From a paper:
Bdp1SANT could be crystallized by vapor diffusion in complex with Brf2, TBP, and a DNA fragment of 25 base pairs (bp) of the human U6 promoter (referred to as TFIIIB–DNA complex hereafter), and the X-ray structure was solved at 2.7 Å by molecular replacement. In the TFIIIB–DNA complex, Bdp1 can be schematically divided into a compact domain constituted by the Bdp1 SANT domain (helix 1–3, residues 303–348) as well as two additional C-terminal α-helices (helix 4 and 5, residues 348–382), and an N-terminal extension that forms an ordered linker (residues 286–302). Bdp1 residues 241–285, which are predicted to form a β-strand region and are essential for promoter opening in yeast, and 383–396 are not visible in the electron-density map, suggesting that in the absence of Pol III these regions are disordered. The SANT domain of Bdp1 interacts with both TBP and DNA, while a structured linker emerging at the N terminus of the SANT domain interacts with the minor groove of the DNA. The N-terminal region flanking the Bdp1 SANT domain, which we named the “Bdp1 linker” (residues 286–302), adopts an extended conformation, spanning the entire length of the minor groove of the DNA and inserting in between the two Brf2 cyclin repeats. Bdp1 residues Y299 and F294 anchor the Bdp1 linker to the major groove of the DNA through aromatic-sugar interactions with the DNA backbone. Bdp1 F294 buries into a hydrophobic cavity formed by the sugar moiety of the DNA, TBP L187, and Brf2 L146. The recognition helix (α3, residues 334–347) of Bdp1SANT contacts both sides of the major groove of the DNA, using conserved polar residues to interact with the phosphate backbone of the template and non-template DNA strands. In particular, the invariably conserved Bdp1 residue R334 forms a salt bridge with TBP residue E191, and contacts the DNA phosphate backbone of the template strand.
RNA polymerase III (Pol III) is the eukaryotic multisubunit DNA-dependent enzyme dedicated to the transcription of short untranslated RNAs involved in essential cellular processes, such as the entire pool of transfer RNAs, the 5S ribosomal RNA, and the spliceosomal U6 small nuclear RNA (snRNA). Transcription initiation requires the action of the TFIIIB complex, which is both required and sufficient to recruit Pol III to the promoter and to faithfully initiate transcription in yeast. In the context of such TFIIIB complexes, TBP recognizes specifically the TATA box inducing a sharp bend of the DNA, whereas the TFIIB-related factors Brf1 and Brf2, similarly to their Pol II paralog TFIIB, recognize TATA-flanking regions and interact directly with Pol III, thus effectively bridging the polymerase to its target promoters. Bdp1 contains a highly conserved SANT domain, which constitutes the major module interacting with Brf1–TBP and Brf2–TBP complexes.
Numbering used by the authors:
A (entry chain B): 157 to 334
B (entry chain C): 286 to 382
C (entry chain A): 65 to 318, 354 to 406
The structure:
């Protein structure tokens, strides 16, 4: 039944509303871990060491948290950025936290004939070796995008919950095997 | 002309490899500035903002312990001292190499 | 009816005529451009994207008929960078929900190798370097099939594989007089640009042919190397299917292991797994934990002075 292979989560993208307008000039100047160039990009780029993540803080009070390895780590990191903003004098709240994207990876430990997969599963496969070495597999159930490499290494992305990464990998494994 | 011309990407923009002491100096910038890469990119005259950010993201992977130490080890930010020290480090080490 | 659509459809037809494509191709490519234009995101796109789109529609048409047109050929004709072409091509394939067949290797071998100027003598092509076009194409195709069977094609740009195979076919057809000529010298006289990965494909193909040579007792005894194996390529290709199967442990009936070169690179570290952590996102956040991310009044003054 199961492959015995568990995809490892490599990246989580989450969003949260701090529920108040923010002065990014103030945040940039008074935080240590902030980067702000409004002429280049309209948001503050903030980093914390644990969980090792990056946040994009917008003047609207909305925030994007990237880089966490678990949904719990993404929430703890998002709460820490919210606490940094609060200490900077803003009445920040922690509203509508939501995981938006999850990236997983694994190795099936056998080589994959991408040129063969693009023939049997043409309607889901996009294999362009003139642009990229991996086959782009757009699974419909669950709606996950997989990057399949000749080495057997697989990248899974577009998931909202952990189970969608696992479901897509369990679906692709027999297709890749035989 | 031909209909079989080789397809290669051309928008590649070159960055010089980081000298062991140019790296030591990069970690000095995380101690003085923190993680504001544009300001650090101003401390390095021949390094762009992206070059600082990619260096940070490489060091983050391979030598995580050094990124964490340079940030926890806060240091007075002296722009002038960094400029003179960087000009000398990039000169002296290049000479000894 | 749109002025930019009429201009685009005219450009689609002009590109097909310049490429000397069969008459049925123009209509299919025009239909894709019209379909593309029904999306508001394409209608409001920059004129540069509408220029690349002309190429995407013609390339998709060629791919569906196994006409071996490369993205590099289209980029040259459209004065487009490959990454500029990549974003429009990937977008329109997703947008129109199209199944795009792969580049047809057998057809690319024929078109690309016919461009090699080695079929007539000239001041730059001496008599001993002149080869029969059909003999050359047939051996190059066999070497491309070998590279494909031994995992040298998958995920790589197909053209450098054909360059390495065409060179090896050419050398093996007259080994005594052509073994001194390098890949770079060969592409220069044939008047074909040398793709950088072609040298790597060559070395991989020679390594594969050497493993095969170990499966023939009368070749195994000659202790062949990447130079001495060239005169036996004809012999090796005569029994390529059989020799590949025998030389490699990995293969089904329905020390050497047939694997892609990126699996045998053998790095000292393979996928350093993220550490297992099951920490809840509900744990207390102390004031000291947060305060380390804040600048002191002195740090604010020292930053302000530096700005």
């Amino acid at each position: 039944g199961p492959s015995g292979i568990v995809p490892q989560l490599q990246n989580i993208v989450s969003t949260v509303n701090l529920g108040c307008k923010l002065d990014l000039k103030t945040i940039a100047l008074r935080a240590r871990n902030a980067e702000y160039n409004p002429k280049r990009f309209a948001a503050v780029i903030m980093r914390i060491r644990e969980p090792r993540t990056t946040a994009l803080i917008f003047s609207s009070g909305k925030m994007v948290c990237t880089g966490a390895k678990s949904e719990e780590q993404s929430r703890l990191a998002a709460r820490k950025y919210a606490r940094v903003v609060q200490k900077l004098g803003f009445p920040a709240k922690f509203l509508d936290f939501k995981i938006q994207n999850m990236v997983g990876s694994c190795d099936v430990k056998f080589p994959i004939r991408l040129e063969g997969l693009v023939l049997t599963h043409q309607q889901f496969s996009s294999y362009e070796p003139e642009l990229f070495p991996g086959l782009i597999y757009r699974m419909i159930k669950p709606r996950i995008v997989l990057l399949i490499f000749v080495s057997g290494k697989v990248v899974l992305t577009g998931a909202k919950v952990r189970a969608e990464i696992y479901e897509a990998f369990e679906n692709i494994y027999p297709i890749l095997k035989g | 002309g031909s209909t079989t011309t080789y397809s290669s990407f051309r928008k590649n923009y070159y960055s010089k490899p980081w000298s062991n002491k140019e790296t030591d100096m990069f970690f000095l910038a995380i101690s003085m500035v923190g993680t504001d890469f544009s300001m650090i990119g101003q401390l390095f005259p021949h390094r762009a903002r992206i070059e600082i950010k990619n260096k940070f993201k490489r060091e983050e992977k391979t030598n995580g312990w050094r990124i964490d130490k340079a940030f926890q080890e806060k240091r007075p930010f002296d722009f002038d001292f960094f400029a003179h020290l960087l000009q000398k480090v990039l000169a002296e080490e290049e000479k000894r190499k | 009816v749109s002025r930019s659509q009429q201009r685009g459809l005219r450009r689609v037809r002009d590109l097909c005529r310049v490429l000397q494509l069969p008459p049925t191709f123009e209509d299919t490519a025009v239909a894709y451009y019209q379909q593309a234009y029904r999306h508001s995101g394409i209608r409001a796109a920059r004129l540069q994207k509408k220029e690349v789109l002309v190429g995407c529609c013609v390339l998709i048409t060629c791919r569906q008929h196994n006409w071996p047109l490369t993205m590099g050929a289209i980029c040259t004709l459209l004065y487009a960078d490959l990454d500029v072409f990549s974003s429009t091509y990937m977008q329109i394939v997703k947008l129109l929900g199209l199944d795009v067949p792969s580049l047809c290797l057998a057809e690319l071998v024929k078109t690309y190798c016919s461009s090699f100027k080695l079929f007539q003598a000239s001041p730059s092509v001496p008599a001993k370097y002149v080869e029969d076009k059909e003999k050359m194409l047939s051996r190059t195709m066999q070497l491309v099939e070998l590279a494909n069977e031994t995992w040298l094609v998958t995920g790589r740009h197909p053209l450098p594989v054909i360059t390495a195979a065409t060179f090896l076919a050419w050398q093996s057809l007259q080994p005594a007089d052509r073994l001194s000529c390098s890949l770079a010298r060969f592409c220069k006289l044939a008047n074909v640009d040398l793709p950088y990965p072609a040298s790597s494909r060559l070395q991989e193909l020679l390594a594969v042919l050497l493993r095969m040579a170990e499966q023939l007792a009368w070749l195994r005894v000659l202790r062949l190397d990447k130079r001495s194996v060239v005169k036996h390529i004809g012999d090796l290709l005569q029994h390529r299917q059989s020799l590949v199967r025998s030389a490699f442990r990995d293969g089904t009936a329905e020390p050497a292991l047939l694997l892609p070169p990126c699996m045998l690179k053998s790095p000292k570290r393979i996928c350093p797994v993220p550490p297992v952590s099951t920490v809840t996102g509900d744990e207390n956040i102390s004031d000291s934990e947060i305060e380390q991310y804040l600048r002191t009044p002195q740090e604010v003054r020292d930053f302000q002075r530096a700005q």
